[PDB]
Design a protein around this ligand. Structure first.
Ligand SMILES: CCCCCCCC/C=C\CCCCCCCC(=O)OC[C@H](COP(=O)(O)OCCN(C)C)OC(=O)CCCCCCC/C=C\CCCCCCCC
Ligand SMILES: Nc1ncnc2c1ncn2[C@@H]1O[C@H](CSCC[C@H](N)C(=O)O)[C@@H](O)[C@H]1O
Length: 209
């Protein structure tokens, strides 16, 4: 989505987000955070995490004490909820407005990127995936959770196709495909699980080569 359309959509979402979309995606969110928590600590016994599209910060309270998490988002409305609820937590290093297409962080500066329900929203996902590879240290990981549209005939595929023109009203691309997370050759796809709701979501871990 164009960035201004992201802002407009998530201004509307923010007051209901946690009790609606956020609530039905909590299991996958917890699972993603559990994976991140389990990764062997980086330097000084800390795991430095970049939360791309941190939103209202529903993942934040689940990060273990050894995590240092930096969250970025495009939406003030969403981010202010993350601030209000979680801004004082010791694991939370900062919460900033930043566009994932252009990350103001050094090459190889993070151990982990978290990208939950965001890659199907961003403008120019090709640019985002390149930035993810750039900021990840060798052997680092991106833990992603996204809906991918299904291939072929049938009712799900048809509804995904019908919702594609509605992106700016909905807040995401319903036709988002797996290929759009795999455009960057420095990121090798590993663990893949289908998660609720209704088997719509894919957890996909990407390893920095
Ligand atoms: C309100 C939209 C209507 C959804 C249609 C119903 C589909 C369920 C039925 C059958 C399954 C097969 C058809 C699938 C068809 C495709 C569904 C789809 O686009 O999926 C992906 C989508 C987003 O995921 P992302 O890209 O990872 O995230 C990025 C964006 N995020 C951060 C918001 O996820 C969902 O659609 C989860 C389910 C909807 C659950 C949302 C909870 C309801 C939301 C708000 C409450 C208001 C409801 C009123 C609207 C109902 C009238 C239609
Ligand atoms: N280019 C971009 N840069 C930063 N944040 C972006 C972005 N495009 C979309 N987003 C953010 O992506 C979020 C999607 S909602 C998902 C929020 C959170 N990860 C969760 O699991 O609940 C929104 O808050 C939106 O503002």
């Amino acid at each position: 989505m164009e960035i201004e359309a992201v802002e407009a959509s998530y201004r509307r979402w923010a007051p209901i987000y946690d009790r609606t979309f956020g609530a039905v995606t909590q299991r996958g969110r917890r699972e993603a955070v559990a994976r991140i928590n389990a990764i062997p600590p980086g330097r000084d016994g800390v795991t430095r995490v970049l939360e791309i599209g941190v939103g209202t910060g529903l993942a934040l309270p689940h990060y273990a004490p050894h995590i240092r998490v930096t969250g970025i988002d495009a939406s003030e409305a969403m981010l202010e909820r993350a601030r209000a609820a979680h801004g004082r937590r010791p694991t939370v290093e900062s919460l900033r407005i930043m566009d994932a297409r252009s990350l103001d962080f050094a090459d190889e500066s993070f151990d982990v990127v978290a990208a939950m329900h965001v890659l199907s929203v961003v403008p120019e996902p090709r640019r985002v995936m390149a930035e993810i590879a750039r900021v990840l240290r060798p052997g680092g990981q991106a833990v992603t959770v996204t809906h991918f549209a299904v291939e072929g005939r049938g009712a799900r595929a048809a509804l995904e196709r019908a919702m594609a023109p509605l992106a700016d009203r909905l807040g995401w691309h319903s036709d988002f495909s797996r290929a759009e997370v795999l455009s960057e050759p420095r990121l090798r796809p590993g663990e893949e699980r289908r998660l609720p709701p209704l088997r719509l979501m894919t957890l996909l871990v990407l390893h920095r080569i």
